[PDB]
């Protein structure tokens, strides 16, 4: 971060391991990068509910000191279920939700 | 492997 900058907002992508086929097992990914400080809440949600067996990879950081983390969970997407990654960080005024776009 | 014998600022 630049001198006199306090914090940096997360940039977020939500994507599946494989192209989405409704009814086929897949993995849901939420990758969050470019944030500081490292304190963050990253939540994978199915219809607003916390998903089973979410895993959180170790954090890395770039030359600008900002952090990155992959968060993922196994899932079986359908035509009707709504999958989001909700991210709360002090550089957001309120938690931000990022919707997975299936593109079946 | 990690460098050993690090120093405080």
């Amino acid at each position: 971060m630049e001198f006199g900058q306090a914090k940096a907002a997360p940039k977020v992508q939500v994507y599946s391991r494989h192209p989405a086929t409704a009814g086929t097992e897949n993995i849901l990914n939420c990758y969050v990068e470019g944030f500081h400080p490292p304190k963050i809440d990253i939540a994978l949600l199915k219809n607003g509910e916390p998903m089973k067996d979410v895993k959180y990879n170790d954090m890395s950081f770039g030359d600008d000191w900002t952090f990155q983390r992959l968060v993922y969970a196994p899932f079986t997407p359908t035509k009707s279920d709504v999958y989001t990654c909700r991210v709360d960080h002090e550089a957001f005024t309120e938690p931000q939700s990022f919707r997975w776009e299936p593109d079946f | 492997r990690l460098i050993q014998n690090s120093i405080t600022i």
Partner: protein, 266 residues
């Protein structure tokens, strides 16, 4: 074909969920292979190839080094707070070091940051430290006056680091030198065309949109290349077009697993 070894060190004054007081992460070619924190208090493997190729003494030594670093980083946080005349609060101390092996030549670096801003960095060519501000100038004088710090770092980065990188690349060759083909899908809404590439390795990739064979650089929006959980990668490119022009467009995907660039239509 190029290779790198990186160590990422993060200490905080106020830990939080997923953020221990002190973490060290090691990575080879951008893949995490070892990790230590102040809670487990041991260096632990994060990939199969490391455990299968080092002895117990490796783990014991990395653990011992990390246990000592934890203490050093606690002091750095206190000292930094005092240097900047700060009250008790949430603060971050980070250091990163590493080496690159590329086409006969080597690169090395060591840099530390406070609250996400530069603090001090090694200038390996002159064996001096580059201070970001007046607070860091005190550290510059201390490290330079010590008289062996810069030298030890040069030795480490130019010899030890590179020697171990060569070993790690050899241990993880089946993983690190493999190629996996992107599975590609094209989509569309309203018209925004989307070209998504799934599960490729290595990370370098080029996804372009073509109108009647013509590259549309100024029109192509791209995400950052991001990892999947299994160490493969994901990338996408989109383009905004007129809904009547749909069939003029193709997505070109260049990647090391593809002898020829792949072409895809919606």
């Amino acid at each position: 074909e190029p290779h790198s070894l990186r160590y990422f060190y993060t200490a905080v004054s106020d830990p939080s969920p997923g953020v221990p007081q002190f973490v060290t992460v090691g990575s080879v070619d951008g893949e995490v292979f070892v990790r230590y924190d102040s809670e487990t208090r041991k260096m632990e493997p994060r990939v199969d190839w490391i455990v299968a190729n080092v002895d117990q003494q490796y783990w014991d030594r990395e653990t011992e080094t990390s246990r000592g670093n934890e203490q050093i980083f606690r002091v750095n946080l206190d000292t930094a707070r005092e240097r900047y005349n700060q009250s008790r609060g949430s603060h971050t101390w980070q250091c990163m070091h590493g080496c690159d092996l590329e086409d006969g030549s080597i690169r090395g670096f060591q840099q530390c940051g406070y609250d996400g801003k530069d603090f001090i960095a090694l200038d390996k060519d002159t064996l001096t430290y580059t201070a970001a501000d007046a607070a860091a100038q005190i550290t510059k004088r201390k490290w330079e006056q010590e008289g062996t710090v810069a030298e030890q770092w040069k030795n480490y980065l130019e010899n030890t680091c590179i020697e171990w990188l060569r070993k790690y690349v050899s241990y993880g060759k089946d993983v690190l030198e493999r190629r996996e083909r992107p599975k590609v899908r094209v989509s569309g809404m309203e018209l925004t065309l989307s070209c998504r590439a799934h599960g490729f390795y290595p990370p370098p990739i080029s996804i372009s949109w073509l109108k009647d064979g013509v590259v549309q650089e100024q029109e192509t929006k791209r995400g950052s290349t991001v990892p999947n959980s299994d160490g493969t990668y994901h990338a996408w490119a989109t383009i905004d077009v007129l809904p009547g022009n749909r069939d003029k467009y193709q997505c070109r995907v260049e990647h090391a697993s593809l002898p020829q660039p792949g072409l895809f239509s919606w």
